[PDB]
Amino acid sequence: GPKFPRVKNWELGSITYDTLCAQSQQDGPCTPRRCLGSLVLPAEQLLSQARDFINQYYSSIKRSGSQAHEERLQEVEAEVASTGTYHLRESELVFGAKQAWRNAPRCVGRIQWGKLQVFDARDCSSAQEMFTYICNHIKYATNRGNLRSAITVFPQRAPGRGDFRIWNSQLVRYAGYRQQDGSVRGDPANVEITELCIQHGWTPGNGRFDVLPLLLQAPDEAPELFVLPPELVLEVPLEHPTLEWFAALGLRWYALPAVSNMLLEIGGLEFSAAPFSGWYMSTEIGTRNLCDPHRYNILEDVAVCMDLDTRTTSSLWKDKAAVEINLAVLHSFQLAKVTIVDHHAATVSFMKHLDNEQKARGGCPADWAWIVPPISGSLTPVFHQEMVNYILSPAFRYQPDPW
Amino acid sequence: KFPRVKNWELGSITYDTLCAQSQQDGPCTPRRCLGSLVLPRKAEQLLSQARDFINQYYSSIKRSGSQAHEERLQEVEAEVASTGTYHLRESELVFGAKQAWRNAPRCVGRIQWGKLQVFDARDCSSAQEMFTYICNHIKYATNRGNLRSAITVFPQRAPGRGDFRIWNSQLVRYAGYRQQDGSVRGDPANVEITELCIQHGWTPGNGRFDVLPLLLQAPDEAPELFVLPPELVLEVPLEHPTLEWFAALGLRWYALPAVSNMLLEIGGLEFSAAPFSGWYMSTEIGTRNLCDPHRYNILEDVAVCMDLDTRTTSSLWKDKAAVEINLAVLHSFQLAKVTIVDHHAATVSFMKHLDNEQKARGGCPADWAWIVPPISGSLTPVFHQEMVNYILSPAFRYQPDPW
Ligand code: HEM
Ligand code: HEM
Ligand SMILES: Cc1cc(N)nc(CCc2cc(N)cc(CCc3cc(C)cc(N)n3)c2)c1
Ligand SMILES: Cc1cc(N)nc(CCc2cc(N)cc(CCc3cc(C)cc(N)n3)c2)c1
Ligand SMILES: C[C@H](O)[C@H](O)[C@H]1CNc2nc(N)[nH]c(=O)c2N1
Ligand SMILES: C[C@H](O)[C@H](O)[C@H]1CNc2nc(N)[nH]c(=O)c2N1
Ligand SMILES: [Zn+2]
């Protein structure tokens, strides 16, 4: 066959050849000797990255080689020459931002990539203004439960000058209080960050679901702390359809999944503060956040209520419970009329996504372990899809925690 | 150079130093990760792969440098020098067999790698004799239901001649009969193989669980059809603790998972027929075999007996039903007194295996996407554990289909 990787679907029996990977300008962790695919974390150089993105842009508008294409090129090196950086045009930001989401090997919601609201915030001057900008994002994106994908782009990393940073990892997060015995009250994922807000004068609450304040950082200034108006932070009380007691557990989650600690890289430019929001997939809440032994860990609690034999694994008690918990998440979101998507619908649309991208780009970089859901793995069609994972740009990046 | 493997549940960290002993290549390159591909589209070497294997053995029994070691190495040099190949001593073979399993990155059951009965069938000359071995291996491994891991090793490949092969992928397989309706009564995975048997003379039944005969091949001979005496094959009808209608589904599965299509490499000699068997981990039966859309596919049926809401995905009927089916399997096997391990027990013992091998060898190759079971991934400790994949020798390979 062809000299690009072959890509079977073992359910349908279909084949495809990924030609997109040939565009990757970035090494990953794997080598012919060993595969590190399962690891979570893995000047002139600018000019040529910049040139690259511009060609992408111009091709995306079908003008590859034309007078405006080669003038914008002339223009970009003119800027770099005399300053070391350069700036994106309004629509260039829009394209590159969409291109980063499109390129994200670990997101399963990519079928939605074309529809995303790019909120330009490169005019932002202070931590106060950051907050305001953000409050607007949450309001738009949340849209009273009929959610809408968006990203707010704050300004970009500069030579020897501070970064714009959101200290929190998500915009909405529950507190995590280290107890004087050893336990954690709240979300254990958010211990450190809780511990940092108090250190910067936050008065902590008491409960399993205390919404955290925002730690925003303007360049060179210390981080300023900001409390989200409660009316802004839409939450969903959880309850089971048929199990009447579930509602009494006092469990809950928030509507807006919005990542705030990732780096948005476009054509060499680095946007250190550019939080994006979508909507949740049922399992993120119900299988990861609530049942991970290192998170809310509510599996044993709920199985006791369901009255299952937890003295032995053969009872598949863990399984059973997880399913009801997931279902409680779905029903409860649907009932409160807030956008959500179960793992079956989500994966079925990712299949359509992969088919769409084959036609258009000749490939789609996918992180299999990440695309396949944390329950009911082989029941979703993606589990039977072989997947190439490589790094394309524009991209999102992990970046060091600022403190 | 040496990779940092993390567990995210516990925050614990290791470094893998074992991967440096890998001499073979994998699919990944630094440009793109192919870890998810199921299979790989892929006088002097033998001398060095032997020396280095023989080295392992003597090092493994503490006599590394001794009389017997020195003198065995010269046995090999002399045997390859005159014959272009050499032969293994039975102990040496027993060692290799145990090791190749130990190295199988996609095997979750490797906690047991030390406990393996090894049948030396290297003095086989007829498909007749093969069938006696195969029959005897089964009678041993099954043990009235108290299963015991085994491998039986037919003659090594040789350059002047064709291989000893078993045509079946497993020693026990249900026939999949094709039908005018574009339908498949029986197991869809065994359609091609059922048709071969027919072509080769066997009378077919027309049940959903018709145990297939064996097609055995001595070098350069036409394959031959041997039937397994019904009694040797242990089956388990499936019932369900709570639900009485389940058994009336007439579902059933066989006790012994025994792979017969793979090749065993040791000291660079190739063992083309070398079946091996252990015991089932329940998900293989209740999830993949019984619910794969391209297999027996009972998910809809079952669910409809359960009177669930098939009409939409968000009722989580696919998951709900999957679980009952997995549960049905465990109960049935525990009831019929037949070795089985559920995904919870197993992955736990594998986490122990990782730890044992960590101290013993400084690592352990593992294929994350095959170790994490096909339901309730995140609910098993493996999900949260980083894993390095690489090719250690002795090893099982895939090989072409003989026909
Ligand atoms: C529209 C609804 C969306 C859904 C249902 C969705 C789904 C998901 C899920 C389930 C994950 C795995 C996260 C985890 O389990 O830890 C993920 C990862 C990711 N998604 Fe989305 N996503 C959506 C929207 C978005 C949007 C709007 C963006 C960017 C604007 C985005 C970019 C990403 C990125 C960069 C990752 C990988 C981040 C990481 O490495 O932690 N997704 N997606
Ligand atoms: C003893 C109890 C055992 C258990 C519970 C077990 C479990 C498993 C499971 C669940 C798989 C995944 C295969 C799939 O779902 O398609 C697997 C793969 C594998 N196991 Fe085991 N195993 C056991 C014993 C053995 C033995 C005795 C051997 C060899 C002597 C072995 C070697 C392998 C190999 C080579 C694979 C890869 C299969 C392939 O690539 O097609 N295991 N094991
Ligand atoms: C701190 C940290 C570092 C790291 N390397 N990995 C993790 C776990 C993965 C993860 C990380 C973040 N920051 C956000 C999500 C929500 C995922 C999400 C985002 C969007 C936009 C929509 C959606 N449905 N889900 C998931 C955390
Ligand atoms: C035909 C074929 C080719 C190919 N490349 N891949 C597959 C799927 C993987 C598979 C193949 C076979 N032959 C047997 C099992 C049972 C796995 C098993 C083995 C043992 C020894 C114990 C156990 N519990 N489970 C799994 C099938
Ligand atoms: C395409 C995908 O990698 C493939 O379906 C894998 C996934 N994980 C698996 N895990 C096991 N144990 N066995 C399998 O056959 C598979 N199939
Ligand atoms: C080690 C392993 O890769 C890790 O546990 C991954 C598995 N898949 C995941 N998938 C998602 N979406 N999020 C995660 O945190 C993880 N964890
Ligand atoms: Zn890889």
Curated annotation (Swiss-Prot), chain B:
Positions bound to L-arginine: 170, 279-280, 284, 289
GO biological process: one example: nitric oxide mediated signal transduction
Family affiliation: Belongs to the NOS family.
Entry GO CC: caveola; cytoskeleton; cytosol; Golgi apparatus; nucleus; plasma membrane
Record note on quaternary structure: Homodimer. Interacts with NOSIP and NOSTRIN. Interacts with HSP90AB1. Forms a complex with ASL, ASS1 and SLC7A1; the complex regulates cell-autonomous L-arginine synthesis and citrulline recycling while channeling extracellular L-arginine to nitric oxide synthesis pathway.
Residues bound to (6R)-L-erythro-5,6,7,8-tetrahydrobiopterin: 36, 369-370, 383
Gene behind this protein: NOS3
Function: Produces nitric oxide (NO) which is implicated in vascular smooth muscle relaxation through a cGMP-mediated signal transduction pathway. NO mediates vascular endothelial growth factor (VEGF)-induced angiogenesis in coronary vessels and promotes blood clotting through the activation of platelets.
Source organism phylogeny: Eukaryota, Metazoa, Chordata, Craniata, Vertebrata
Subcellular location(s) per record: Cell membrane; Membrane, Caveola; Cytoplasm, Cytoskeleton; Golgi apparatus
The name this protein goes by in its record: Nitric oxide synthase 3
Region Interaction with NOSIP, residue ranges: 32-403
Covered range of the whole protein: 69 to 482 of 1205
